[PDB]
Short mmCIF file of N, CA and C and ligand atoms in Angstrom, two decimals:
data_model
loop_
_atom_site.label_atom_id
_atom_site.label_comp_id
_atom_site.label_asym_id
_atom_site.label_seq_id
_atom_site.Cartn_x
_atom_site.Cartn_y
_atom_site.Cartn_z
N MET A 4 83.97 100.51 96.18
CA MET A 4 85.07 101.88 95.30
C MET A 4 85.63 100.14 94.42
N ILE A 5 86.01 101.19 93.61
CA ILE A 5 86.86 100.45 91.49
C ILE A 5 88.98 100.85 92.13
N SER A 6 89.40 100.27 92.45
CA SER A 6 90.75 100.29 91.97
C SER A 6 91.01 99.95 90.68
N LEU A 7 92.59 101.17 89.79
CA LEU A 7 92.66 99.69 89.15
C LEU A 7 94.59 100.46 89.89
N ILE A 8 95.27 99.11 88.67
CA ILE A 8 96.59 98.47 89.16
C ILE A 8 97.18 97.95 88.95
N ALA A 9 98.20 98.91 88.15
CA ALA A 9 99.63 98.41 86.97
C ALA A 9 100.79 99.22 87.50
N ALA A 10 101.69 98.30 86.28
CA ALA A 10 102.76 99.24 86.70
C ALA A 10 103.77 99.49 84.95
N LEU A 11 103.98 101.25 84.88
CA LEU A 11 103.63 101.34 83.24
C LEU A 11 105.16 101.93 83.13
N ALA A 12 106.21 101.45 82.21
CA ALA A 12 106.91 102.27 81.71
C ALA A 12 106.86 104.06 81.02
N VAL A 13 107.89 104.29 80.70
CA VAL A 13 107.50 105.55 79.82
C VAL A 13 106.17 105.57 78.49
N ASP A 14 105.32 105.58 78.37
CA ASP A 14 105.10 106.21 77.36
C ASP A 14 103.77 105.24 77.53
N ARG A 15 103.19 104.79 78.81
CA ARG A 15 102.12 104.39 79.37
C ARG A 15 102.21 102.14 79.24
N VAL A 16 104.10 101.92 78.29
CA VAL A 16 103.60 100.98 78.21
C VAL A 16 103.07 99.71 79.28
N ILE A 17 102.41 98.58 79.38
CA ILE A 17 102.23 97.82 79.57
C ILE A 17 102.36 96.18 79.53
N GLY A 18 102.54 96.30 77.89
CA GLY A 18 102.84 94.81 77.30
C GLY A 18 103.36 94.61 75.86
N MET A 19 104.03 93.55 75.81
CA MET A 19 104.78 93.22 74.97
C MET A 19 104.12 91.85 74.43
N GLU A 20 104.88 91.43 73.17
CA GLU A 20 104.72 90.19 72.60
C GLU A 20 105.09 89.27 73.52
N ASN A 21 106.56 89.47 74.01
CA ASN A 21 107.64 88.65 74.73
C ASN A 21 107.32 89.09 76.23
N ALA A 22 108.29 88.23 77.23
CA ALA A 22 108.44 88.97 78.37
C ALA A 22 108.91 90.55 78.21
N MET A 23 108.15 91.25 79.33
CA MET A 23 109.11 92.34 79.76
C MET A 23 110.41 92.64 80.13
N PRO A 24 111.35 93.15 79.85
CA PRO A 24 112.76 93.43 80.05
C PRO A 24 113.29 93.84 81.30
N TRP A 25 112.13 93.57 82.30
CA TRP A 25 113.24 94.47 83.48
C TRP A 25 112.79 92.68 84.79
N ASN A 26 113.62 92.79 85.70
CA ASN A 26 113.23 92.44 86.79
C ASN A 26 112.13 93.16 88.15
N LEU A 27 111.50 92.71 88.74
CA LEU A 27 111.19 94.26 89.91
C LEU A 27 110.74 92.67 90.66
N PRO A 28 111.35 92.84 91.62
CA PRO A 28 110.29 91.47 92.74
C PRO A 28 110.16 92.58 93.60
N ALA A 29 110.32 93.92 94.18
CA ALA A 29 110.03 95.01 94.72
C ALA A 29 108.47 95.10 94.55
N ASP A 30 108.08 95.22 92.94
CA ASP A 30 106.72 95.49 92.95
C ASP A 30 105.78 94.78 92.31
N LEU A 31 106.04 93.33 92.55
CA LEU A 31 105.38 92.12 92.77
C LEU A 31 105.17 92.35 94.11
N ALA A 32 105.90 92.51 95.43
CA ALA A 32 105.31 92.86 96.68
C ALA A 32 104.59 93.30 96.77
N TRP A 33 104.95 94.43 96.03
CA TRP A 33 103.95 96.28 96.10
C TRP A 33 102.50 95.99 95.63
N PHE A 34 102.31 95.02 94.92
CA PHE A 34 100.88 94.58 94.31
C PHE A 34 101.09 93.94 95.17
N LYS A 35 101.20 92.61 95.66
CA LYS A 35 100.86 91.71 96.89
C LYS A 35 99.96 92.47 97.93
N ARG A 36 100.46 93.67 98.56
CA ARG A 36 100.44 94.12 99.70
C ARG A 36 98.98 95.10 99.38
N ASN A 37 99.03 95.37 98.42
CA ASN A 37 97.52 95.84 97.54
C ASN A 37 96.57 94.97 97.20
N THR A 38 96.39 94.12 96.57
CA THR A 38 95.41 93.43 96.17
C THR A 38 95.02 92.61 97.52
N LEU A 39 96.33 92.26 98.00
CA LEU A 39 95.76 90.70 98.89
C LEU A 39 94.47 90.62 99.85
N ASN A 40 93.01 89.32 99.96
CA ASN A 40 92.52 89.87 100.70
C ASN A 40 91.23 90.47 99.88
N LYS A 41 91.16 90.99 98.78
CA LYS A 41 90.75 92.19 97.68
C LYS A 41 90.15 90.60 96.72
N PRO A 42 88.89 90.94 96.01
CA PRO A 42 88.20 90.40 94.42
C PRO A 42 89.71 91.84 93.90
N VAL A 43 90.00 90.67 92.55
CA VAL A 43 90.80 91.01 91.66
C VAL A 43 89.57 90.88 89.91
N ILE A 44 90.19 91.31 89.23
CA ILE A 44 89.30 91.38 88.26
C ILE A 44 90.39 91.70 86.51
N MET A 45 90.64 90.48 85.55
CA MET A 45 91.28 90.25 84.71
C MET A 45 91.08 89.88 83.47
N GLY A 46 91.16 90.32 82.93
CA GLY A 46 90.72 90.11 81.20
C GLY A 46 91.85 88.39 81.41
N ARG A 47 91.15 87.26 79.83
CA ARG A 47 91.39 86.32 79.75
C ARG A 47 93.72 86.02 79.42
N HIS A 48 93.88 86.98 78.69
CA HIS A 48 95.12 87.18 78.53
C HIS A 48 95.75 87.63 79.47
N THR A 49 95.57 88.17 80.46
CA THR A 49 96.57 88.60 81.54
C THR A 49 96.23 86.85 82.39
N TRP A 50 95.19 86.86 83.08
CA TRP A 50 95.09 85.40 83.62
C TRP A 50 95.96 84.04 82.44
N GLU A 51 95.62 84.12 81.53
CA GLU A 51 96.82 83.22 80.59
C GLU A 51 98.17 83.47 80.78
N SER A 52 98.82 84.71 81.18
CA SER A 52 99.71 85.04 81.98
C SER A 52 101.16 84.99 83.56
N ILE A 53 99.79 85.07 83.74
CA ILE A 53 99.68 84.61 85.30
C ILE A 53 99.97 82.83 86.00
N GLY A 54 98.72 82.05 85.00
CA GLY A 54 99.36 80.52 84.74
C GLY A 54 98.94 79.74 86.14
N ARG A 55 97.99 80.56 86.78
CA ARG A 55 97.66 80.09 88.52
C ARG A 55 96.82 81.60 88.42
N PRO A 56 95.94 80.59 89.85
CA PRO A 56 94.74 81.61 90.96
C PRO A 56 96.11 82.38 91.73
N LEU A 57 95.89 83.61 92.19
CA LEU A 57 96.45 84.80 92.69
C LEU A 57 95.56 83.85 94.01
N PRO A 58 96.65 83.48 94.76
CA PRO A 58 96.03 83.05 96.94
C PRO A 58 95.43 84.08 96.93
N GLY A 59 94.75 84.03 98.18
CA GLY A 59 94.33 85.09 99.03
C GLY A 59 93.35 86.27 98.89
N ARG A 60 92.86 85.51 96.88
CA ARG A 60 92.24 86.65 96.13
C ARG A 60 90.87 85.91 96.07
N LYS A 61 89.47 86.62 95.78
CA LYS A 61 88.49 86.12 94.73
C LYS A 61 89.12 86.46 93.15
N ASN A 62 89.27 85.38 92.39
CA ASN A 62 89.95 85.98 91.42
C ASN A 62 88.79 86.05 90.11
N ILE A 63 88.31 86.38 89.48
CA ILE A 63 87.35 87.08 88.46
C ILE A 63 87.97 86.98 87.73
N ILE A 64 87.56 86.46 86.24
CA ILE A 64 88.72 86.27 84.64
C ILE A 64 87.43 86.88 83.82
N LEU A 65 87.24 87.95 82.72
CA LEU A 65 86.55 88.46 81.79
C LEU A 65 86.53 87.40 80.65
N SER A 66 85.86 87.19 79.84
CA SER A 66 85.83 85.88 79.05
C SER A 66 84.38 86.19 78.25
N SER A 67 84.83 86.17 77.31
CA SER A 67 83.35 86.07 75.90
C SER A 67 83.06 84.75 76.42
N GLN A 68 84.02 83.18 75.87
CA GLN A 68 83.93 82.16 75.77
C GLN A 68 83.60 81.81 77.46
N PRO A 69 83.09 80.25 77.48
CA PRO A 69 82.77 79.22 78.69
C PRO A 69 84.62 79.37 79.20
N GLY A 70 84.50 79.08 80.57
CA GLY A 70 85.61 79.05 81.72
C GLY A 70 86.01 77.86 81.13
N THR A 71 87.52 77.92 81.65
CA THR A 71 88.51 77.00 81.17
C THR A 71 89.64 76.14 82.46
N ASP A 72 88.73 76.53 83.53
CA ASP A 72 88.96 76.39 85.12
C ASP A 72 88.56 76.80 86.24
N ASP A 73 88.11 75.93 87.01
CA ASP A 73 86.52 75.68 88.12
C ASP A 73 87.23 76.41 89.31
N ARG A 74 88.92 76.15 89.22
CA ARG A 74 89.39 77.50 90.43
C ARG A 74 88.91 79.05 90.44
N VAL A 75 88.37 79.40 89.33
CA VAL A 75 87.83 81.04 89.54
C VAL A 75 86.83 81.08 88.73
N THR A 76 86.15 82.43 88.91
CA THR A 76 84.95 82.51 88.39
C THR A 76 85.59 83.70 87.12
N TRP A 77 84.72 83.24 86.32
CA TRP A 77 84.22 83.69 84.71
C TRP A 77 83.16 84.57 84.65
N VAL A 78 83.23 85.75 83.88
CA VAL A 78 82.18 86.39 83.78
C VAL A 78 81.91 86.61 82.38
N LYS A 79 80.98 87.37 81.61
CA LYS A 79 81.39 87.51 80.44
C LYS A 79 81.10 89.01 79.22
N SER A 80 80.86 89.85 81.06
CA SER A 80 80.27 91.24 81.02
C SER A 80 80.92 91.91 82.30
N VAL A 81 81.26 93.26 81.80
CA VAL A 81 81.34 94.30 83.12
C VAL A 81 80.16 94.08 84.25
N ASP A 82 79.48 93.71 83.71
CA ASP A 82 78.35 94.36 85.06
C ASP A 82 78.44 92.55 85.56
N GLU A 83 78.78 92.47 84.89
CA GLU A 83 78.83 90.63 85.49
C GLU A 83 79.63 90.70 86.68
N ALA A 84 81.16 90.91 85.96
CA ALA A 84 82.51 90.85 86.66
C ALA A 84 81.44 91.57 88.41
N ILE A 85 81.49 93.20 88.05
CA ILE A 85 81.47 93.79 89.09
C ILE A 85 80.34 93.14 90.13
N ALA A 86 79.14 92.41 89.63
CA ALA A 86 78.64 91.93 90.20
C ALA A 86 79.35 90.61 91.18
N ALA A 87 79.88 89.85 90.64
CA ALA A 87 80.55 88.90 91.14
C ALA A 87 81.48 89.01 92.64
N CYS A 88 81.85 90.67 92.40
CA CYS A 88 82.71 90.62 93.50
C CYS A 88 82.09 90.75 94.43
N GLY A 89 80.68 91.02 94.51
CA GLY A 89 79.83 90.97 95.45
C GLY A 89 80.13 92.39 96.48
N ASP A 90 79.50 92.46 97.74
CA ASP A 90 79.56 93.69 98.91
C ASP A 90 80.87 93.59 99.71
N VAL A 91 81.92 94.40 98.76
CA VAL A 91 83.24 94.92 99.32
C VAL A 91 83.75 95.96 99.77
N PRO A 92 84.44 96.48 99.79
CA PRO A 92 84.50 97.62 100.34
C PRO A 92 85.47 98.71 99.11
N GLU A 93 86.80 97.52 98.25
CA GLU A 93 87.53 97.85 97.32
C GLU A 93 87.67 96.49 96.48
N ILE A 94 87.39 96.53 95.19
CA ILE A 94 88.04 95.95 93.40
C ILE A 94 88.84 96.50 92.77
N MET A 95 89.49 94.89 92.89
CA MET A 95 91.11 95.11 92.53
C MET A 95 91.06 94.73 91.16
N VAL A 96 91.36 96.31 89.85
CA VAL A 96 91.37 95.94 88.30
C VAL A 96 92.66 95.58 87.75
N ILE A 97 92.79 94.31 86.86
CA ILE A 97 94.70 94.23 87.79
C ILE A 97 95.23 94.32 85.78
N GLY A 98 93.81 94.59 85.11
CA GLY A 98 94.89 94.76 83.49
C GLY A 98 94.14 92.84 83.26
N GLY A 99 94.39 93.35 81.62
CA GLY A 99 95.45 94.71 80.49
C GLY A 99 94.92 95.05 80.37
N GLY A 100 95.53 95.89 78.93
CA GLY A 100 94.71 96.78 78.44
C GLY A 100 93.09 97.16 78.53
N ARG A 101 92.49 95.96 77.34
CA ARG A 101 91.30 95.84 77.51
C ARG A 101 90.73 96.18 78.68
N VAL A 102 91.16 95.34 79.51
CA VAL A 102 90.46 95.14 81.05
C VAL A 102 90.32 97.15 81.75
N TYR A 103 92.10 97.94 81.50
CA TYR A 103 92.03 98.82 82.11
C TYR A 103 91.38 100.72 81.32
N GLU A 104 90.59 99.89 80.41
CA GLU A 104 89.93 101.18 79.21
C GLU A 104 88.57 100.65 80.09
N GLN A 105 87.59 99.75 79.85
CA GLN A 105 86.99 99.99 80.47
C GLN A 105 85.82 100.24 81.40
N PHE A 106 87.24 100.33 82.85
CA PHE A 106 86.84 100.18 83.98
C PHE A 106 87.90 102.05 84.70
N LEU A 107 88.41 102.00 83.80
CA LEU A 107 89.16 103.99 83.96
C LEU A 107 87.92 104.64 84.56
N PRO A 108 86.85 105.11 83.32
CA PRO A 108 85.46 105.78 83.84
C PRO A 108 84.91 105.74 85.00
N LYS A 109 84.87 104.31 85.60
CA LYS A 109 84.34 103.80 86.83
C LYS A 109 85.06 103.99 88.42
N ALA A 110 86.51 104.44 87.93
CA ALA A 110 87.47 103.68 88.86
C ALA A 110 87.81 105.67 90.15
N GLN A 111 87.92 104.80 91.28
CA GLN A 111 88.20 106.35 91.76
C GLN A 111 89.68 106.35 92.86
N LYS A 112 90.63 105.54 92.45
CA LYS A 112 91.79 105.08 92.93
C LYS A 112 92.27 105.03 91.80
N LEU A 113 94.14 104.72 91.63
CA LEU A 113 95.12 104.39 90.30
C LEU A 113 96.36 104.19 91.56
N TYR A 114 96.55 102.92 91.27
CA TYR A 114 97.74 102.15 91.81
C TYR A 114 98.97 102.06 91.53
N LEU A 115 99.73 103.19 91.12
CA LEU A 115 100.96 103.24 89.72
C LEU A 115 102.16 102.85 90.01
N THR A 116 103.06 101.94 89.09
CA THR A 116 104.01 101.75 89.59
C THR A 116 104.47 102.84 88.45
N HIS A 117 105.39 103.58 88.34
CA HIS A 117 106.19 103.95 87.28
C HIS A 117 107.64 104.08 86.89
N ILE A 118 108.04 102.97 86.14
CA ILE A 118 109.11 102.08 85.74
C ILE A 118 110.12 103.02 85.24
N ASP A 119 111.17 103.56 84.85
CA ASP A 119 112.14 104.23 84.45
C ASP A 119 113.16 103.23 83.24
N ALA A 120 112.09 102.89 82.36
CA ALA A 120 112.45 102.00 81.10
C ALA A 120 111.47 102.47 80.03
N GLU A 121 112.06 102.85 78.76
CA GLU A 121 111.97 102.93 77.79
C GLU A 121 112.04 101.56 76.55
N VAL A 122 111.07 100.94 76.91
CA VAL A 122 110.54 99.29 75.21
C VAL A 122 109.67 99.97 74.37
N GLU A 123 109.26 99.51 73.44
CA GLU A 123 108.22 99.31 72.54
C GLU A 123 106.96 98.17 73.16
N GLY A 124 105.94 98.45 73.18
CA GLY A 124 105.09 97.32 73.29
C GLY A 124 104.12 97.59 72.85
N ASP A 125 102.66 96.62 72.49
CA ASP A 125 101.50 96.53 72.25
C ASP A 125 100.55 97.09 72.68
N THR A 126 100.89 97.33 73.90
CA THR A 126 99.60 97.07 74.64
C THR A 126 99.88 98.38 76.07
N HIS A 127 99.18 99.79 76.02
CA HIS A 127 98.95 100.90 76.83
C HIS A 127 98.15 100.43 77.90
N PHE A 128 98.56 101.33 79.32
CA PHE A 128 97.29 101.69 80.05
C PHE A 128 97.19 103.25 79.22
N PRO A 129 94.92 103.45 79.82
CA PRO A 129 95.07 104.12 79.23
C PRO A 129 95.81 105.88 79.39
N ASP A 130 95.29 106.49 78.66
CA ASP A 130 95.58 107.85 78.53
C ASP A 130 95.00 108.66 79.77
N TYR A 131 95.43 109.64 80.83
CA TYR A 131 95.11 109.81 81.67
C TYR A 131 94.82 111.16 81.64
N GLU A 132 94.20 112.15 82.66
CA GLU A 132 94.88 113.32 82.45
C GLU A 132 95.28 113.66 83.82
N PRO A 133 96.52 114.92 84.52
CA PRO A 133 96.94 114.42 85.92
C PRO A 133 96.04 115.36 87.17
N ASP A 134 95.86 116.25 85.85
CA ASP A 134 94.87 117.37 87.02
C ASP A 134 93.20 116.88 87.30
N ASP A 135 93.00 115.68 86.72
CA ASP A 135 91.51 115.06 87.61
C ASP A 135 92.09 114.19 88.32
N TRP A 136 93.41 113.90 88.93
CA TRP A 136 93.62 113.30 89.89
C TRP A 136 94.28 114.03 91.11
N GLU A 137 94.27 113.46 92.25
CA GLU A 137 95.00 113.70 93.34
C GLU A 137 96.16 112.88 93.39
N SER A 138 97.12 113.59 93.61
CA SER A 138 98.35 112.26 93.95
C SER A 138 98.72 111.91 96.00
N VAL A 139 98.14 111.31 96.19
CA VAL A 139 98.02 111.41 98.18
C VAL A 139 99.65 109.86 98.49
N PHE A 140 99.62 109.72 97.63
CA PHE A 140 101.20 109.17 97.55
C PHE A 140 101.90 108.90 97.22
N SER A 141 103.46 108.71 97.44
CA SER A 141 104.70 108.57 95.95
C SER A 141 105.84 108.59 96.65
N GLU A 142 106.12 107.12 96.27
CA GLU A 142 107.47 106.68 97.07
C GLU A 142 108.64 106.22 95.39
N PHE A 143 109.44 106.76 95.51
CA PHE A 143 110.69 106.54 94.47
C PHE A 143 111.96 106.13 95.33
N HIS A 144 112.17 104.68 94.41
CA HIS A 144 113.44 103.87 95.12
C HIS A 144 114.30 103.65 93.17
N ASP A 145 115.70 103.48 93.51
CA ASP A 145 116.43 103.60 92.55
C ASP A 145 116.93 101.72 92.50
N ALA A 146 117.10 101.38 91.10
CA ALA A 146 117.80 99.96 91.21
C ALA A 146 118.59 99.48 91.88
N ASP A 147 118.62 98.35 91.95
CA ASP A 147 120.00 97.81 93.25
C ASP A 147 119.95 96.20 93.17
N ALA A 148 120.36 95.58 93.83
CA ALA A 148 120.92 94.38 92.71
C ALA A 148 119.85 93.52 92.83
N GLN A 149 118.86 93.59 92.82
CA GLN A 149 117.56 92.75 92.88
C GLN A 149 116.39 93.37 91.41
N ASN A 150 116.66 94.76 91.80
CA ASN A 150 115.32 95.34 90.57
C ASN A 150 116.44 96.26 90.13
N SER A 151 115.98 96.20 88.37
CA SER A 151 117.06 96.37 87.09
C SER A 151 116.41 97.55 86.96
N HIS A 152 115.89 98.51 87.19
CA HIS A 152 115.62 99.55 86.63
C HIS A 152 114.83 100.67 88.63
N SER A 153 114.97 101.91 87.96
CA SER A 153 114.25 102.45 89.20
C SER A 153 112.90 102.53 88.78
N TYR A 154 111.93 102.77 89.69
CA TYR A 154 110.32 102.54 89.87
C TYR A 154 110.37 103.88 90.76
N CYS A 155 108.58 104.38 90.45
CA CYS A 155 108.44 104.58 91.51
C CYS A 155 106.85 104.64 91.64
N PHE A 156 106.46 104.30 93.01
CA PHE A 156 105.37 103.59 93.66
C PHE A 156 104.51 105.02 93.27
N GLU A 157 103.28 104.99 93.21
CA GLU A 157 101.79 106.42 92.91
C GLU A 157 100.62 105.90 93.55
N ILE A 158 99.99 106.71 94.20
CA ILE A 158 98.08 105.87 94.66
C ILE A 158 98.18 107.93 94.59
N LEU A 159 97.41 107.96 93.67
CA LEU A 159 95.92 108.84 93.08
C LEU A 159 94.81 108.65 92.92
N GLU A 160 93.77 109.33 93.66
CA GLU A 160 92.18 109.69 93.75
C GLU A 160 92.12 110.72 93.26
N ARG A 161 90.76 110.26 92.91
CA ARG A 161 89.96 111.25 92.09
C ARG A 161 89.64 111.73 91.79
N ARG A 162 89.61 113.60 91.41
CA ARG A 162 89.13 114.51 92.16
C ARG A 162 87.56 114.94 91.87
N1 NAP B 1 102.37 96.01 83.36
C1 NAP B 1 100.85 95.31 84.14
O1 NAP B 1 100.84 96.71 85.29
C2 NAP B 1 100.18 94.95 83.12
C3 NAP B 1 99.02 94.50 84.12
C4 NAP B 1 98.20 93.36 83.64
C5 NAP B 1 98.26 92.71 81.98
N2 NAP B 1 99.61 93.24 81.55
C6 NAP B 1 99.80 92.57 80.17
O2 NAP B 1 98.42 93.51 79.66
C7 NAP B 1 98.61 92.49 78.31
C8 NAP B 1 97.05 91.81 77.52
O3 NAP B 1 96.46 92.90 77.42
P1 NAP B 1 95.32 92.71 76.62
O4 NAP B 1 94.58 93.98 76.47
O5 NAP B 1 95.85 92.20 75.64
O6 NAP B 1 94.57 91.50 77.51
P2 NAP B 1 93.50 91.45 78.70
O7 NAP B 1 92.61 92.72 78.66
O8 NAP B 1 93.67 91.15 80.06
O9 NAP B 1 92.79 90.22 78.01
C9 NAP B 1 91.19 90.42 77.20
C10 NAP B 1 90.61 89.79 76.51
O10 NAP B 1 89.29 89.61 77.92
C11 NAP B 1 88.40 89.66 77.73
N3 NAP B 1 87.32 91.20 77.66
C12 NAP B 1 87.48 92.49 77.98
N4 NAP B 1 87.11 92.66 78.40
C13 NAP B 1 85.47 91.66 78.18
C14 NAP B 1 84.18 92.48 78.32
N5 NAP B 1 83.43 93.40 78.34
N6 NAP B 1 83.58 91.26 77.74
C15 NAP B 1 84.09 89.95 77.78
N7 NAP B 1 85.04 89.39 77.69
C16 NAP B 1 86.28 90.74 77.95
C17 NAP B 1 88.57 88.92 76.20
O11 NAP B 1 88.60 87.51 76.52
P3 NAP B 1 88.04 86.34 74.96
O12 NAP B 1 89.40 86.78 73.76
O13 NAP B 1 88.24 85.47 75.83
O14 NAP B 1 86.99 87.28 74.48
C18 NAP B 1 89.96 89.34 75.95
O15 NAP B 1 90.40 88.95 75.16
C19 NAP B 1 99.51 91.03 78.08
O16 NAP B 1 100.67 91.69 77.94
C20 NAP B 1 99.83 91.27 80.16
O17 NAP B 1 100.88 90.80 79.96
C21 NAP B 1 100.64 94.20 82.20
N1 FOL B 2 102.29 97.14 90.03
C1 FOL B 2 101.50 95.82 89.42
N2 FOL B 2 102.88 94.72 89.23
C2 FOL B 2 103.14 93.74 88.06
O1 FOL B 2 103.71 93.13 87.82
C3 FOL B 2 101.27 94.04 87.77
N3 FOL B 2 101.46 93.00 86.86
C4 FOL B 2 99.82 92.50 85.88
C5 FOL B 2 99.17 91.84 86.31
N4 FOL B 2 100.39 90.44 86.01
C6 FOL B 2 100.54 89.56 87.73
C7 FOL B 2 101.36 88.83 87.14
C8 FOL B 2 102.05 87.68 88.30
C9 FOL B 2 101.99 88.05 89.17
C10 FOL B 2 102.24 87.30 90.80
O2 FOL B 2 102.63 86.75 90.30
N5 FOL B 2 101.88 87.57 91.83
C11 FOL B 2 102.28 86.86 93.17
C12 FOL B 2 103.41 86.76 93.06
C13 FOL B 2 104.01 88.25 94.47
C14 FOL B 2 105.79 87.62 94.58
O3 FOL B 2 106.14 87.67 94.56
O4 FOL B 2 105.57 89.28 96.27
C15 FOL B 2 100.98 87.63 94.05
O5 FOL B 2 100.73 87.09 94.79
O6 FOL B 2 100.21 88.82 94.24
C16 FOL B 2 100.85 88.81 90.01
C17 FOL B 2 100.33 89.72 87.87
C18 FOL B 2 98.67 93.97 86.99
N6 FOL B 2 99.45 94.61 87.92
C19 FOL B 2 100.66 94.79 88.06
N7 FOL B 2 100.69 95.83 88.75
#
């Protein structure tokens, strides 16, 4: 099974030139819980923004160019990225926009964080049709002393 995981503001914004103007440790805890011990596939821009390998996960980076860090696995196409995952129950695709676009048609589950924030961005999660997906889990949280905005975790499974 292939799954996508993302945090989206309104209008599906997931990225901007500068750092996002939110602080959501609860969302990062959620991303951790849902990705540990599974292979994660990311594109090279997302790799550069994370800055290190994510512990406890097989990290697979898509790039057209030769790799620059032997601690992770570098692949040059989508088919190679899936092959590099091996025989696992669930592959986690962690972005960014160009990567989500290519993997959406293959995905059976979406793990989405919807954030109550309006921001101008340059990168969006792909458009998806709510009726093509079943909402199996949803939980809303208010902002608090640690988290700057309200947010809702949702898991969707493809109909
Ligand atoms: N809010 C969230 O959930 C979230 C999640 C992830 C990322 N983000 C944000 O999203 C932004 C980056 O997204 P993005 O679309 O610019 O970048 P991206 O998808 O992370 O990376 C794109 C890069 O991946 C490589 N690539 C992609 N598909 C490929 C293919 N089929 N074959 C070979 N290489 C391929 C290319 O690397 P080369 O250029 O080296 O060829 C490409 O330039 C940042 O703002 C980041 O912080 C947000
Ligand atoms: N829901 C969700 N939220 C995100 O912020 C997110 N970010 C990415 C890409 N960027 C990042 C950036 C940093 C870390 C990170 O440092 N995570 C650590 C720390 C978690 C914690 O502080 O609890 C990790 O071990 O996963 C992960 C992904 C992809 N999917 C996402 N999905």
